[PDB]
Every structure is written in structure tokens, then in C-alpha cells.
Design a protein around this ligand. Structure first.
Ligand code: HEM
Ligand SMILES: *[C@@H]1O[C@H](CO)[C@@H](O[C@@H]2O[C@H](CO)[C@@H](O[C@H]3O[C@H](CO)[C@@H](O)[C@H](O)[C@@H]3O)[C@H](O)[C@H]2NC(C)=O)[C@H](O)[C@H]1NC(C)=O
Ligand SMILES: *[C@@H]1O[C@H](CO)[C@@H](O[C@@H]2O[C@H](CO)[C@@H](O[C@H]3O[C@H](CO)[C@@H](O)[C@H](O)[C@@H]3O)[C@H](O)[C@H]2NC(C)=O)[C@H](O)[C@H]1NC(C)=O
Ligand SMILES: *[C@@H]1O[C@H](CO)[C@@H](O[C@@H]2O[C@H](CO)[C@@H](O)[C@H](O)[C@H]2NC(C)=O)[C@H](O)[C@H]1NC(C)=O
Ligand SMILES: *[C@@H]1O[C@H](CO)[C@@H](O[C@@H]2O[C@H](CO)[C@@H](O)[C@H](O)[C@H]2NC(C)=O)[C@H](O)[C@H]1NC(C)=O
Ligand SMILES: [Ca+2]
Ligand SMILES: [Cl-]
Ligand SMILES: [Cl-]
Ligand SMILES: [Cl-]
Ligand SMILES: [Cl-]
Ligand SMILES: [Cl-]
Ligand SMILES: [Cl-]
Ligand SMILES: [Cl-]
Ligand SMILES: [Cl-]
Ligand SMILES: [Cl-]
Ligand SMILES: [Cl-]
Ligand SMILES: [Cl-]
Length: 595
């Protein structure tokens, strides 16, 4: 019946059980089941996997074997016929700041990460793949359909490598393939501190006994810190401008430099740690480094949970928030905290919220310079624009003043991402994130669209007319049917995002259900949830419900004007107020006394 074990990629050491602090690997959160929610374990399955050979081969791998009677349409073709659009006019969200999109990518990276398989570097299969598009082993190419412009310009495919799985990393067979989640499942700010002890330690400043995080020594942002540079050459960040040779940043998560605005947010969090750390030393001079580090790390973890659950989720889920996430009632040690495989695709809805340009604003929110509005694709793994071109402040003003892209059925994913995505392994700005998502969907063996509608207790359309009704769109339904032949075959990623948004939210009914369950589970199944009695004191808690992203900005940048509600669309200068008007985090409740 049960396959209750395999376990090598699985970090391992004892629990303190009385320690008031989370471990780095997530281990020991649950006392009865210690590895529950830990990093480097398999992603949870809410539904049985669906592979072509029922074991590990993804659908579309063998070109003669169908899925429910039909061939699965090429990922790229679905991308071309349904996901793309040309006109960026009128695509912006009239009531969601650019920060709304950016916070999601943060939360996301704190929750899941399914890295690609290795099988060595000095490899020539990493070459056999992008070079000859030969499917086999972990190379699973995204072929181009006929009439694709990339055929004339890029080759016959886009290389793609399968995601890592448990038990090993190499040639495996037995049980059904299960992907790895290299990060901790709890909302614990592991994207700032790391998910491995090795990496957690390297990020720390273990010279001064101040419990500070290591900062860049080669550059400063007007007296403020930058994350240290990465050790690793060759570096993607310097590849995109060999004259500036500015390496990628080093952080608790390896995706930190994936795009300038994500690197900006990471910098804000690293700065807040140090601020909290030296601010604490000022109240408790006897406390040592470890103590300063852990007590800071704890506040920051609580901070991320509060903004997320109090300001972020209510405006994603909308009126469905209360339906899936009822008021907190206490830690439930029986709740499965782990991130499911499907969540890592459902949370990718944020990809349709990314706009095609990033702006830099000057002190009183005017265009910063002449090349102030930049195309998104010039910013992937671009760190030199931060170091050499103004610091983070100008980028932060743009997060508050500019808007997120609104999901639109006739305009899903901007071309900056759909045709010009830059991958760290490769050299070109010619990848397609939408095609990647779909090929990945299949790589993870995801059940079709209708299996998930059933799971969420929602109708399952079997016909065209039925699909029109659910999507409330005749044209979109048609295209989907033409490519998939049956709703049963629609990949969850596009199926889920193709649904119209629920009242006051930004995701449809299927997504709201998937997102909702997961968040309820990681709150309820987290022994260290900030509201769990005994984790913080009542006074420490009254002091924490006063935090805000605005304040975080005021305390860690030289910006002096900020909106009160950073997540909603704000117009300068009316909606903006002076920093000294916003509530500070009162740390006195963290002071101690001797005898
Ligand atoms: C400029 C903005 C962004 C870029 C360039 C970007 C890029 C990427 C790339 C390259 C992947 C890996 C795909 C794969 O190989 O399977 C990925 C994964 C993902 N992204 Fe994004 N992303 C962006 C924004 C966002 C946002 C705003 C959200 C949510 C609000 C989000 C959620 C996710 C999730 C859930 C994954 C899968 C992670 C895993 O392995 O567990 N992303 N992104
Ligand atoms: C732009 O987006 C905003 C959110 O979608 C929207 O306002 C939000 O509506 C909620 C409705 O519940 C309100 O939130 C709080 O309202 C009162 C305060 O007066 C509280 O006592 C309640 O507990 C509730 O949480 C706010 O009015 C607002 N939400 C937040 C967090 O501020 C705006 O109206 C939207 N603008 C337009 C033009 O649609
Ligand atoms: C690669 O990075 C280069 C620097 O990291 C960058 O060049 C820099 O940006 C512009 C050049 O276009 C110059 O900015 C302005 O500087 C002053 C004005 O304040 C004047 O000298 C000029 O008017 C100039 O426009 C920087 O001086 C320049 N720095 C260097 C060393 O060239 C490149 O644009 C980047 N190249 C690519 C392909 O990304
Ligand atoms: C570790 O922390 C120490 C203490 O702040 C840092 O040293 C200070 O850094 C700058 C010099 O670059 C100046 O403020 C002083 O010279 C130093 N002060 C003291 C008291 O030594 C050090 O830079 C940090 N190291 C890392 C890698 O982040
Ligand atoms: C703790 O959460 C678990 C789910 O992880 C809940 O378990 C339910 O237990 C009831 C009986 O009390 C059964 O009817 C169901 O089989 C369980 N439901 C689910 C969704 O698994 C339980 O309700 C919670 N326990 C407490 C005390 O709140
Ligand atoms: Ca985490
Ligand atoms: Cl799943
Ligand atoms: Cl096509
Ligand atoms: Cl700083
Ligand atoms: Cl450095
Ligand atoms: Cl990424
Ligand atoms: Cl909360
Ligand atoms: Cl370019
Ligand atoms: Cl029907
Ligand atoms: Cl709204
Ligand atoms: Cl300002
Ligand atoms: Cl807000």
C-alpha cells in the first residue's frame, strides 16, 4: 500500500524542541513528524501524478501515444495562439501597484523551488540539447510549430531540462516520479536567510558579534548596503554587459537576480535585518551575536507573514478569502504544511501581472533621466543598473507609483517574457516563459484541468458550449478546444488562468481554491506562526500588527514620501504622505532585565 520512504537528498540532524527558533531547513517544526515541511523533500501530491507511462514520462514525450485519445498540442503553439498579444495599450491594472506583482514573486520564492536536474557540468549533453534538440533523458525540448518566427531566427527548439526528483538525482525507475522542493514550506523568510546551513552561514557576518548579515564591500547605496556579490564565475549578470562586469547578488535564494526589481526587494529585506539587529543591540547590550541574529530573523519572518496575510492575500482571493482562509484558531499539528506540486503552478498566475516596462523615478516622482523607462527584457539578470545607475531608491519609487499588469483573456503574457526571456544557462534573450510553464506542467505530471475542477468541487465542462460558459468567453474556449480537443487535456496552468476573476480578486474560482487551501495549510500547520500563543508575547504582538511595507521603505531607503496602502494603485502626490506620519515598529517590548 504505502511507499513511506526513500531519502538521500534529505538534510538531516537533531531537534532541540525547546529552542524558541525555527531551524534553517524547516526541520523540527512539527515534533511528531520532524521532516514535515522541510526543504529538499518532495513536493506534496494532492492528487495522483499523471505521466504518459504512468511512472515518469511526461505527456507529449512519445509521439504516437495520446492523452485521452488526442495528441497534446506543443507548448509553444499554445503560447502563440492563446497567450500572446501585441498591443500593450490599456493593459495596466487601475488598482494594483507594481508592488502587488513584486510581493507575489517574493512569497512564491519563500515557498517553493523545483530546480532542474544536473548530471554534471563539463557536460556535452547540455550541449547536445540546445544544439541538436535531441529529446532524451532529462532534455525535453520545446519544439517550434510550423510558421513560428523563431524557426527562421533561433533554430528548431528551445532547450528545456526536466526538474529534479527524489530518491536521487540520476537514472531512476520504481515509484512515480516526485519533484523536489529545495526551500522550506513555511512562510519563514528563507529567501533572505537560506534553506541550507551551508548557505545560511556564508550569508552571515561572523566577525562582529552583532548578528548582522554580510553586505557588499565593493559598493554602497548612498551609505546604505547592497547584497554581497556572488562567488561564481561564469556569471549571467556580467554576461549581459561584459564591460560593466557586475556579478550577480548573493542571497538566501538563488533566483534573487532574476530581475532587477526582485533584487531590489531582496536588498530591502537584508537592510531591514541589519537595522533590527543593531536596533536590538541598543536595548539588550548583553545579548550575543547568535541571539541578535535569531531574534532579528524571527521579527522579519513575522513581518513577511503579516503583510502577506493581512495586505496581500485579501486582494488576490477577493471575496473568496473567507471561504478558504477562516480566522486563525491556533496551531493544528495534524495539518500538512508542505507545498503541493500543483501550487507551484497555480502561484504562477503572477506571470500575467508583469508589465512590459520598468521605470525609475526621481526624488519627487518624476522620470529619472532620459532612459527612465526600460523594457523588461533588458533587466533579466541585470545588476549593473543598480550599482552603476542610481541605486535602488529610483526603482523603489516606481514600485509604488507604477501599476501591475492586469490579467486579460485576450492579452495574457507580455512579449518581454513570452519571446525574450533570458535563461542563466544560455546566451540569448529568446526564451518563452509561457511555453516553459506548460512544458513544466507536463514535466511535473500534473492532472488535467478538469481533475482540478472536480477537486475544488466545481463543474467540469466536457463540451465547447460548456467551456464557453465557465470561461464566459466564446473565442477563447474555441481556441482551447481546437488545440486540446477536450477540456480534460487542458494543462492546469493555462486552464486555471483562463478563468474570469472573482469579485475583488485577481484570480478565478479554480485558482482561488488552490491558492486558498495552500495558504490556510501553511498558516495552520506552522508551529511558529506569529499568532501562535507563546511564540511572541502579547505586547510583542500589539507592536507587530503595526508594521507596513511603507514603513519598511521609510526605514531602509532615502525615500521620504510613501502611500499608506502600498499595494493599491496610488497617485502622486495626493495619495503620498511624509514618512514621519507612518507608524514605526516599537521594539521596546523586546528589552530584557537581569535580576
Ligand atoms: C519579471 C517577473 C518574473 C520573471 C522574469 C519570472 C521568471 C521565472 C522563471 C524563469 C521560472 C522557472 C520556470 C521553470 O523553469 O519551470 C519561474 C518560476 C516561477 N515563478 Fe516566476 N517570474 C516572474 C514573476 C513571478 C511572479 C510575479 C509570481 C507570483 C506572483 C511568480 C511565480 C512563480 C512560481 C510559483 C514559479 C515556480 C517555482 C518553483 O520551482 O517552485 N513569478 N519564474
Ligand atoms: C482599490 O482596491 C481596494 C481593495 O481592492 C479597494 O478598497 C478596499 O476595500 C475594502 C473592503 O473591505 C476596505 O477594507 C477595509 O475597510 C474598512 C476600513 O474603512 C475596514 O474596517 C474593514 O475591515 C476592511 O478590511 C478598504 O476600502 C480597502 N482595503 C484596504 C486594505 O484598504 C478600493 O476601493 C479600490 N478602489 C476602487 C476605485 O475600486
Ligand atoms: C554596460 O554598462 C556601462 C556602464 O556600466 C553602460 O555605460 C554607461 O552608461 C552611459 C553610456 O551609455 C553613460 O552615462 C552618461 O554618463 C555621463 C552623464 O552623466 C556622460 O559621460 C554621458 O552623457 C553618458 O551618457 C556612462 O558613463 C556609461 N559608463 C561607461 C563606463 O561607459 C553601458 O550602457 C552598458 N552597455 C550595455 C550594452 O548594456
Ligand atoms: C561585519 O560587521 C562589521 C561591523 O559593522 C563591519 O565593519 C565596519 O564596516 C565599515 C568598514 O567597511 C566601517 O563601518 C568600519 O570600518 C567597520 N566597523 C567596525 C566596528 O569594525 C564589516 O564591514 C562587516 N563585514 C561584512 C562582510 O559585512
Ligand atoms: C486539524 O486539521 C485537521 C486537518 O489537517 C482536521 O481534521 C479533520 O478531522 C475531522 C474530525 O474532527 C474529520 O471529519 C476530517 O477527516 C478531518 N478533516 C480534514 C480536512 O482532514 C481537524 O478538523 C483539525 N483539528 C482541530 C482540533 O481543529
Ligand atoms: Ca520558506
Ligand atoms: Cl499535486
Ligand atoms: Cl503557431
Ligand atoms: Cl544598511
Ligand atoms: Cl562582496
Ligand atoms: Cl526565477
Ligand atoms: Cl495575519
Ligand atoms: Cl536585449
Ligand atoms: Cl458540459
Ligand atoms: Cl478591486
Ligand atoms: Cl522621495
Ligand atoms: Cl494595501
Amino acid at each position: 500500500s504505502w511507499e513511506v520512504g526513500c531519502g538521500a537528498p534529505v538534510p538531516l540532524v537533531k531537534c532541540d524542541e525547546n529552542s524558541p527558533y525555527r531551524t534553517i531547513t524547516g526541520d523540527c517544526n512539527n515534533r511528531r513528524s520532524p521532516a514535515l515541511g522541510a526543504a529538499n523533500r518532495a513536493l506534496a501530491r494532492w492528487l495522483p501524478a499523471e505521466y504518459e507511462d504512468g511512472l515518469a514520462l511526461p505527456f507529449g514525450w512519445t509521439q504516437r501515444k495520446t492523452r485521452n485519445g488526442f495528441r497534446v498540442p506543443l507548448a509553444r503553439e499554445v503560447s502563440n495562439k492563446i497567450v500572446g498579444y501585441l498591443d500593450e495599450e490599456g493593459v495596466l491594472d487601475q488598482n494594483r501597484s507594481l508592488l502587488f506583482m513584486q510581493w507575489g514573486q517574493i512569497v512564491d520564492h519563500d515557498l517553493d523551488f523545483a530546480p532542474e536536474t544536473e548530471l554534471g557540468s563539463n557536460e556535452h549533453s547540455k550541449t547536445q540539447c540546445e544544439e541538436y534538440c535531441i529529446q532524451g533523458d532529462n532534455c525535453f525540448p520545446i519544439m517550434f510549430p510550423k510558421n513560428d518566427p523563431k524557426l527562421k531566427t533561433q533554430g528548431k527548439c528551445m532547450p528545456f531540462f526536466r526538474a529534479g526528483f527524489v530518491c536521487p538525482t540520476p537514472p531512476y525507475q520504481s515509484l512515480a516520479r516526485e519533484q523536489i522542493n529545495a526551500v522550506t514550506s513555511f512562510l519563514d523568510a528563507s529567501l533572505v536567510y537560506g534553506s541550507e546551513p551551508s548557505l545560511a552561514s556564508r550569508l552571515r557576518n561572523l566577525s562582529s558579534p552583532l548578528g548582522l548579515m554580510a553586505v557588499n564591500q565593493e559598493a554602497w547605496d548612498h551609505g546604505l548596503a547592497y547584497l554581497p556579490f556572488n562567488n561564481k564565475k561564469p556569471s549571467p549578470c556580467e554576461f549581459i554587459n561584459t564591460t560593466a562586469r557586475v556579478p550577480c547578488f548573493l542571497a538566501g535564494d538563488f533566483r534573487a537576480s532574476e530581475q532587477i526589481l526582485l533584487a531590489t526587494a531582496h536588498t530591502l529585506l537584508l537592510r531591514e535585518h541589519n537595522r533590527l539587529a543593531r536596533e536590538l543591540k541598543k536595548l539588550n547590550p548583553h545579548w550575543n551575536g547568535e541571539k541578535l541574529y535569531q531574534e532579528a530573523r524571527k521579527i522579519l519572518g513575522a513581518f513577511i507573514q503579516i503583510i502577506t496575510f493581512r495586505d496581500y492575500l485579501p486582494i488576490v482571493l477577493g471575496s473568496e478569502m473567507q471561504k478558504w482562509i477562516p480566522p486563525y484558531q491556533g496551531y493544528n499539528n495534524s495539518v500538512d504544511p508542505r507545498i503541493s506540486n500543483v501550487f507551484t503552478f497555480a502561484f504562477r498566475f503572477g506571470h500575467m501581472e508583469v508589465p512590459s516596462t520598468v521605470s525609475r523615478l526621481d526624488e519627487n516622482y518624476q522620470p529619472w533621466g532620459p532612459e527612465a523607462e526600460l523594457p523588461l527584457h533588458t533587466l533579466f539578470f541585470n545588476t549593473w543598473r543598480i550599482i552603476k545607475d542610481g541605486g535602488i531608491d529610483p526603482l523603489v519609487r516606481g514600485l509604488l507609483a507604477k501599476k501591475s499588469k492586469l490579467m486579460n483573456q485576450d492579452k495574457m503574457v507580455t512579449s518581454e517574457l513570452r519571446n525574450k526571456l533570458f535563461q542563466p544557462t544560455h546566451k540569448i534573450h529568446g526564451f518563452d516563459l509561457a511555453a516553459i510553464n506548460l512544458q513544466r506542467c507536463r514535466d511535473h505530471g500534473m492532472p488535467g484541468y478538469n481533475s482540478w475542477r472536480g477537486f475544488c468541487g466545481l463543474s467540469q465542462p466536457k463540451t465547447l458550449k460548456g467551456l464557453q460558459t465557465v470561461l464566459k468567453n466564446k473565442i477563447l474556449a474555441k481556441k482551447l478546444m481546437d488545440l486540446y480537443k477536450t477540456p480534460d487535456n487542458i494543462d492546469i496552468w493555462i486552464g486555471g488562468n483562463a478563468e474570469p476573476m472573482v469579485e475583488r480578486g485577481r484570480v478565478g474560482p479554480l485558482l482561488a481554491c488552490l491558492l486558498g487551501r495552500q495558504f490556510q495549510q501553511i498558516r495552520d500547520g506552522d508551529r511558529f506562526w506569529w499568532e501562535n500563543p507563546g511564540v511572541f508575547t502579547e505586547k510583542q504582538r500589539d507592536s507587530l500588527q503595526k508594521v507596513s511595507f511603507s514603513r519598511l521603505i521609510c526605514d531602509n531607503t532615502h525615500i521620504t514620501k510613501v502611500p499608506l496602502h502600498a499595494f493599491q494603485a496610488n497617485n502622486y502626490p495626493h495619495d503620498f504622505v511624509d514618512c514621519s506620519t507612518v507608524d514605526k515598529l516599537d521594539l521596546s517590548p523586546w528589552a530584557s532585565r537581569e535580576n
